[PDB]
Amino acid sequence: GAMGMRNLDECEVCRDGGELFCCDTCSRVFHEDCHIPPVEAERTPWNCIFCRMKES
Ligand SMILES: [Zn+2]
Ligand SMILES: [Zn+2]
Numbered sequence: 648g649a650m651g652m653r654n655l656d657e658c659e660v661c662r663d664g665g666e667l668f669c670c671d672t673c674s675r676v677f678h679e680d681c682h683i684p685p686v687e688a689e690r691t692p693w694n695c696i697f698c699r700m701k702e703s
Contacts, residue, residue, distance in 0.1 A: 673697035
């Protein structure tokens with residue numbers, strides 16, 4: 648994108664239809680890491696795990 652980085656072409660899991668659990672800001676930076684691990688219980692795509700990672 649113009650101001651967005653969706654490097655999903657190198658993202659095997661995106662082709663599989665994998666969901667992102669990161670916000671725009673974190674996905675553009677850690678897209679590959681943001682697919683790991685997908686939560687198989689409460690799939691909350693609006694909940695950013697990388698933002699929640701910076702708890703301290
Ligand atoms: Zn991806
Ligand atoms: Zn985030």
